[PDB]
Amino acid sequence: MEMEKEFEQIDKSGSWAAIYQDIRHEASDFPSRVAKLPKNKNRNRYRDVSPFDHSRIKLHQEDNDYINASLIKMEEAQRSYILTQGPLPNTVGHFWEMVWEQKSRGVVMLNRVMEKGSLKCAQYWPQKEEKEMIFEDTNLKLTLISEDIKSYYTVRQLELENLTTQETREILHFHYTTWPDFGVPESPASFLNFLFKVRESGSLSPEHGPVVVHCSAGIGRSGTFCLADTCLLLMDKRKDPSSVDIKKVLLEMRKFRMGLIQTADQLRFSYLAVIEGAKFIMGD
Numbered sequence: 001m002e003m004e005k006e007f008e009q010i011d012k013s014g015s016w017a018a019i020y021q022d023i024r025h026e027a028s029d030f031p032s033r034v035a036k037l038p039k040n041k042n043r044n045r046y047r048d049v050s051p052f053d054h055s056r057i058k059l060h061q062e063d064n065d066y067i068n069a070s071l072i073k074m075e076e077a078q079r080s081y082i083l084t085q086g087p088l089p090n091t092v093g094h095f096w097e098m099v100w101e102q103k104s105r106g107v108v109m110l111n112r113v114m115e116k117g118s119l120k121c122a123q124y125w126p127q128k129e130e131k132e133m134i135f136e137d138t139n140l141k142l143t144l145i146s147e148d149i150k151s152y153y154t155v156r157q158l159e160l161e162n163l164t165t166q167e168t169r170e171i172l173h174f175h176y177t178t179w180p181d182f183g184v185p186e187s188p189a190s191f192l193n194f195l196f197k198v199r200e201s202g203s204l205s206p207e208h209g210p211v212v213v214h215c216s217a218g219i220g221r222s223g224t225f226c227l228a229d230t231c232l233l234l235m236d237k238r239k240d241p242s243s244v245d246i247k248k249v250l251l252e253m254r255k256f257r258m259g260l261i262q263t264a265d266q267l268r269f270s271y272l273a274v275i276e277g278a279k280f281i282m283g284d
């Protein structure tokens with residue numbers, strides 16, 4: 001079926017939970033043996049969220065190459081994404097090592113450091129220009145260059161230096177700051193505006209390594225971001241945009257990381273975002 005009318009048909013019939021459970025039943029199951037090794041327990045935020053072995057990002061290190069991060073490679077859309085958990089106190093150096101080694105331009109953050117009164121990820125970037133951060137375990141230096149605070153999101157320019165080679169690179173930090181502590185946003189308008197700002201920066205384009213996107217577990221809000229982006233790109237590429245099947249795209253993405261889209265409300269929100277986004281692209 002088309003999307004917008006399949007949407008109204010699920011709303012009127014109140015069957016979002018049944019649709020979402022079907023997705024959960026059909027999703028891929030692949031091994032995640034490296035994630036479960038005892039030496040990696042303090043590298044995982046949640047015991048039930050792990051990268052598959054076949055798609056995990058490897059650190060360029062001979063001691064321990066493990067990070068909780070997955071490469072989502074979308075062949076028809078010609079887009080790739082790295083989805084990862086919010087960094088932990090003992091993985092902030094691994095996080096920036098990955099950004100460096102994978103040649104990423106941008107980092108997309110969809111959570112606040114504290115939500116619901118608890119810590120959802122480490123404070124992994126510097127908050128003042130004159131107070132830079134040094135990660136001694138991976139030999140990197142990170143400096144805040146500039147910050148632009150807007151009503152729904154903040155964009156930061158950061159300098160990452162590989163202290164071993166003295167090479168430097170500019171990284172863009174795109175921080176969506178207004179996702180509610182409970183539920184999903186009422187309108188997708190600010191989330192779509194944010195997606196378009198990431199696109200306009202070059203961070204999603206083939207001349208760079210894959211964008212790094214995270215929330216707390218790296219599957220819920222993060223899944224919503226890449227699912228909406230890929231569906232909108234396919235609607236632009238194809239002769240028949242009504243042929244884009246959001247459930248099929250989500251199942252394809254779940255071949256590369258478990259659990260993408262965590263609730264039926266996140267599934268409904270993803271439909272809403274693609275539907276509204278397709279009107280703004282045109283041609284209107």
Ligand SMILES: COC[C@H]1N(S(C)(=O)=O)[C@H]2CC[C@]1(O)CC2
Binds near residue numbers: 018264
């Ligand atoms: C408690 O939520 C009810 C669910 N339905 S339903 C009846 O379609 O599954 C609507 C859409 C998703 C919800 O989780 C929120 C309202």
